Write a protein that binds this ligand. Sequence first.
Ligand SMILES: NC(=O)c1ccc[n+]([C@@H]2O[C@H](COP(=O)([O-])OP(=O)(O)OC[C@H]3O[C@@H](n4cnc5c(N)ncnc54)[C@H](OP(=O)(O)O)[C@@H]3O)[C@@H](O)[C@H]2O)c1
Ligand SMILES: NC(=O)c1ccc[n+]([C@@H]2O[C@H](COP(=O)([O-])OP(=O)(O)OC[C@H]3O[C@@H](n4cnc5c(N)ncnc54)[C@H](OP(=O)(O)O)[C@@H]3O)[C@@H](O)[C@H]2O)c1
Ligand SMILES: [Cl-]
Ligand SMILES: [Cl-]
Ligand SMILES: [Cl-]
Ligand SMILES: [Cl-]
Ligand code: NA
Ligand code: NA
Ligand code: NA
Ligand code: NA
Lengths: 266, 267, 267, 266
Amino acid sequence: SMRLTVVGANGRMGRELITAIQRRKDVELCAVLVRKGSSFVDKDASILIGSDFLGVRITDDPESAFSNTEGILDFSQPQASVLYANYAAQKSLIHIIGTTGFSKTEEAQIADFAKYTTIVKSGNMSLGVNLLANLVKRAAKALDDDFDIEIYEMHHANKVDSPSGTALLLGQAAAEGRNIMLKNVSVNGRSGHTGKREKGTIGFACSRGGTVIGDHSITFAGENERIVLSHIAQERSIFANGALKAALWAKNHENGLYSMLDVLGL
Amino acid sequence: SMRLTVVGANGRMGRELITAIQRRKDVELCAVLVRKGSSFVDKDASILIGSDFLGVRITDDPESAFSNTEGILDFSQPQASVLYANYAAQKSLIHIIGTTGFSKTEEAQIADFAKYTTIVKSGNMSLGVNLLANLVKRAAKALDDDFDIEIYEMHHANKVDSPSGTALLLGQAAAEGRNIMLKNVSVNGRSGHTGKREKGTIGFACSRGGTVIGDHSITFAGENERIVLSHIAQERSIFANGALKAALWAKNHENGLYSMLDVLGLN
Amino acid sequence: SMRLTVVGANGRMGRELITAIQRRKDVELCAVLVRKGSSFVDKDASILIGSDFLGVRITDDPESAFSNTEGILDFSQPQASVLYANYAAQKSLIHIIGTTGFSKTEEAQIADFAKYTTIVKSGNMSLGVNLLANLVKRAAKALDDDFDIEIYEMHHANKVDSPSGTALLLGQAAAEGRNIMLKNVSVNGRSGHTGKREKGTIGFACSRGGTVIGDHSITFAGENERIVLSHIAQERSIFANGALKAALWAKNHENGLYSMLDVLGLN
Amino acid sequence: SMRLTVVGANGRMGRELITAIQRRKDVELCAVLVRKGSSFVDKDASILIGSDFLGVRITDDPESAFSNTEGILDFSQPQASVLYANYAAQKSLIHIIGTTGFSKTEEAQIADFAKYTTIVKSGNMSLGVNLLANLVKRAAKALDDDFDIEIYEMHHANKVDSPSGTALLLGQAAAEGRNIMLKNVSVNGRSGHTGKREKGTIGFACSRGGTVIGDHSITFAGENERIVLSHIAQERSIFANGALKAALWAKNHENGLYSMLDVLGL
Ligand SMILES: NC(=O)c1ccc[n+]([C@@H]2O[C@H](COP(=O)([O-])OP(=O)(O)OC[C@H]3O[C@@H](n4cnc5c(N)ncnc54)[C@H](OP(=O)(O)O)[C@@H]3O)[C@@H](O)[C@H]2O)c1
Ligand SMILES: NC(=O)c1ccc[n+]([C@@H]2O[C@H](COP(=O)([O-])OP(=O)(O)OC[C@H]3O[C@@H](n4cnc5c(N)ncnc54)[C@H](OP(=O)(O)O)[C@@H]3O)[C@@H](O)[C@H]2O)c1
Ligand SMILES: [Cl-]
Ligand SMILES: [Cl-]
Ligand SMILES: [Cl-]
Ligand SMILES: [Cl-]
Ligand code: NA
Ligand code: NA
Ligand code: NA
Ligand code: NA
C-alpha cells in the first residue's frame, strides 16, 4: 500500500482524492493538508468527505503533512504547488501535480525540482483526454492549414484559469501536428477582435457557467466541412483516479518530469 | 398569388429575394427597383440572378415600381425605406422592412405610416432566429440568475463583426428577460481573463473558421443542469424565406407596425 | 425557514430530498415518513443518507409526520398521495406531488383538496425539463410542419425505458403545440426503417451507453435552418431542487392545483 | 481532359456533379443520363444547373450515354448502379459509385464487375469522413469495450437509406479497431428495444428532417467520460469533388474494386 498525502484537501479535487483513496486497498491516506487558519485543522479527515472516522488528523503544517509519506497528491493553486514541489525536492517525495495555470518561471522551477525527485505533472489526468490529444495531433497532421483549428471549452462558474489546462494541452498537440509553435499561433478570445482570421492560427473560446465539470471540443473547419473531436467529463472521480494511477507509477521510478502519457503508454 | 416588388435589388438581399420568389407559385415578382442611375436600369430582372428571361424590367423609378403591386420587400437604406413606407401608406401596400440604422425621427414616421397600412419591421428576418430570441427571453425570465447565461457562435473565417449581430440580438433578448442592460452585464472573451465568473453577467464566446454560415447557442447553466437553445443556419436564403412569410401574413392583416414575433404568433 | 416533511422516505427521491434539505438554510427537515413496518421506523433520519445525527426520528405514522410541518414533499404511491393530500387540505399544508400513476378518481379527489390548500403536481420536477417542455410546445406552435420535429436522447447503458419518460413528455409537448396526437404521429427508431420521412411525424432516436445521466435534444429542422432545444442533466439532485423551489413558491401562494409551469411563471 | 458521363443526372448529386465538372478544366462533360420518360430528355444539360448552353444533349439511353466516354459518375439508386456497373464491365469504362443502400447480392455483383474494369465504390467521398474513419478505428482500438460505441446521424427528410452509408462505414472502422465483425454486434434503433445494453455492441441512431446535408457523431461512452468524434458536411459539393478526384485516379489504374482510402492515401 502506497502512503499518500493530499494537499488542497478542502478543495473540490482534494475531497475527491480523499474519497478515492478511501475506496481502494492499494493506496493509504496518511496525511491531509489545508491552509493555515482553516477551521478543519485538528479535525479528522472524515469530515471532508462525510465518511466514517479515518484516524487521520488534518494539519496546516507541511513539515507534519510531509514527514511520513511516499507521495504528494496536489490539485491546488499554482504558487502553492511550486512551494510543494520544493518540499517534494527537499524530502525526496513523489509529487503528482494536477494544478494548472502556471507561469513560465513557475514551470522552470518545477523543472528544477524534477532533478531531485519524481514529478508527474499534467493538466488532465483522464484517459479520454490523453487519447483525444493524440487524435488531435494526427488530425492536425492529416489536415493542412486550409482547415482552421478552433478550440472550445466550458467549465463551472468558479474555475479560475482560462483557457483550461486541457485546452492548452490540446492546443499543443494540434501545434505539434502542424509542426508549429503554439505561442506563435494562438489567439485567445476572438470575441474581442476585428479582422480576417489569420491562417494557421489556433483559436481558443471559453464559457464559464453553472457546475459543468469540463467539456472540450476541437473543430477543424475547412472548405464546406468540419471534423469535431470532443471530450465530456462527467465527474471529478476520473481525475482523482488518474492521479492515483500516476502516484503508483511514480513510486519506484527514477527522478524526472513526466506526463500522463508516460503514466498511461501512450 | 401575391404580387411583390423587391427594392434595393442590386443590394444585400435583393438577389436572394428574387431567387426565392422565382421558385414559388404563391408569390409573383412584379417589379424590381434599384438606386438612381444603376447599370441595371432597363435590364430584365433575370440579369441579377442568371435565370431565363423573367418579363420584369428593372427600374429606378418608385412611381413605376409601386404602380401595380401588393407588397414591398425592402432591405435597402433608412432614408429610402421611409420614402417607400410613405408609398405603402398612400397606395395600401404591405411593407416588409429589413433595413437597419433608422434615426428616432425615421422610426416615428414609420409609426405614422403604420396607421394606414400593415408594416412588418425586423432587423433579422429569419423565422428561426426570431423564434430563438423569444425562447431565450422566456428562459431568461423563468430561470433565476443562479442559471448562468453564456452565448456561443461560430462563423466562417472571413466574418468581420464579432460577436455577430445575431449573437447581440440574442444577448439583448436575455438581458430583457432578466430585466438588466446588456451593456452593463456583457463579457466578451472570458478566454482573455482570469478569476471567478461574476454573477448575472452574460458571456460571449466567438469562434471563426472555415466556411460556417452561422451557428448560435445559448446555454443556461445552473446547479447540475443546463438548458441549451441553438440556431443553425444552412443557407442565407432563410432571410428571404422569412421576409416572404411576413409578406403573406401581412397581406390581409389589419393595419399596424408588426415584428416577426407577430408573424410567428408569439404575443 | 420552511418546515418540510419528506414522505416515501426509503423510496425513490427520499434520500435526495433529505440530502438537499440538509444542505440548505432556507428549508428545515422536520419529519420523515416511511411505509408501515419499515426497518427505518424509530431510526434517526441520518441513517438514510449517512450524515451526522439530525434530530428527526423516522415514523410510519402520518399523524405524527404531519403534526407540525408546513409542507409535504411526496414522490411515493398514488393511494398514499391522495391520503396525504387530504391531510394537506385538513391541516393547510402545501403538498408537492411527484407521484405518478393516478386514476381518474384519484385525480378528481386531488382537485377537491386543491380548493383548500396549495398543491403543485408534476410527474417531472426538474426546473429545466419543465422549461424545455414549454419552449418545445411554443416552438411547435410557432413553426409550421415544414419544420420536422426529431427528438434525441442519450442515457447510461443500464437504462430500462426507451424512449425515456422525459423524451415522451417532450414529444407530448410537441404534439400539443402542433394540435396532433403523439400516438398517431410518433416514429421510434428510423434506423430500423426505409423510405422518405412522413410529413408531420415526430421521430425518436435513443442512444444507450456508459454512465450518462440524461441528455435530451429536440430538433426542428426546416428549409435551410434548424432550431435545437436541449436539456443536459448533470446529477439526479435536480428533481429535489425543483421540488424545493415548488415548496418555497407554494408557501404563501393562494389555494389551487398548480404545475411546475406555474412555479416557473409560464402561464 | 477526362471525358465523363453523369447518371442520375436530375438528382441532387447528379446536378452537383454537373456543376462541378463545368467549373473545372481537367474534366469534360460528355454525356448526361436520366430515366426513360423524363421531361429532360433531348434538352441541353445546362437546364439541370441553370448555366450557359453546354452542347450536351440529355439522353435516356445508356448505349448513347456510354458510347463515347471514359467514366461513369454515379450517385443514383442501388438497382440502377448494379445495372450501370454491368455496362461499365461490358464497355470497359471506369465507374465511380457513390450510391448507397446495396444488398449483399448487389455488392457481390459489383465485385464480379470489378474483375473487368476499375470501380471506386464509397459511401462517402469527402476527405473529412475518410480521416474520421481512421480516427474512429484508432479510438476503438485504444479504448476497450468498457467504452460503449454509439453512432448517431442526421440527414434531410427525403433520404431513403438508414443508417447512412457513412454511418455504416464508420461502424466498420470501429468494428475493425475492436477486432470484431460489425454484423455480429450492430444494433439498429435502440428506441424499439427493452433490456440492458449488450456489451461490445455498436448502436445506430438516425434522425431525418429538413434539409440537413449530413451530420455524423461517434460516441465512446465509458465510466464517467465520453469521447465524441464528429463530421459535419456543409454542402454536397464536397462529395462531387471527391468523385471527380476518384475518376481522375481511376483513369489509368488497373482493374479492381477500390475505396476513397485508395484514392486519397490513406
Ligand atoms: N489535472 C487535472 O486532471 C485537473 C482536474 C481538475 C482540476 N484541475 C486543476 O486543479 C486545481 C484545483 O481545482 P479545484 O476545483 O479543486 O480548486 P478549489 O476547489 O479552488 O481548490 C483549491 C485548493 O487549494 C488550496 N490552496 C490554494 N492556495 C493555497 C495556499 N497558498 N496554501 C494552501 N492551500 C492552498 C485551497 O484552500 P483554501 O480553501 O484555503 O483557499 C483549496 O483547498 C485547479 O488548478 C484546476 O484547474 C486539474
Ligand atoms: N457517397 C457519397 O459521398 C454520397 C453523397 C451524397 C449522396 N450519396 C448517395 O447517393 C445516392 C443519391 O443521392 P441523391 O440525394 O442525389 O438522390 P436523388 O436526388 O433521389 O437522386 C436519385 C437519382 O437517381 C435516379 N434513378 C433512380 N433509379 C433510377 C433508375 N432505375 N434508372 C435511372 N435513373 C434512376 C433518379 O431519377 P428519377 O428522378 O427519375 O427517379 C435520380 O436522378 C443516395 O444513395 C445517397 O445515399 C452518396
Ligand atoms: Cl477545473
Ligand atoms: Cl440597388
Ligand atoms: Cl418508505
Ligand atoms: Cl444523402
Ligand atoms: Na485506502
Ligand atoms: Na413566383
Ligand atoms: Na436545512
Ligand atoms: Na469541364
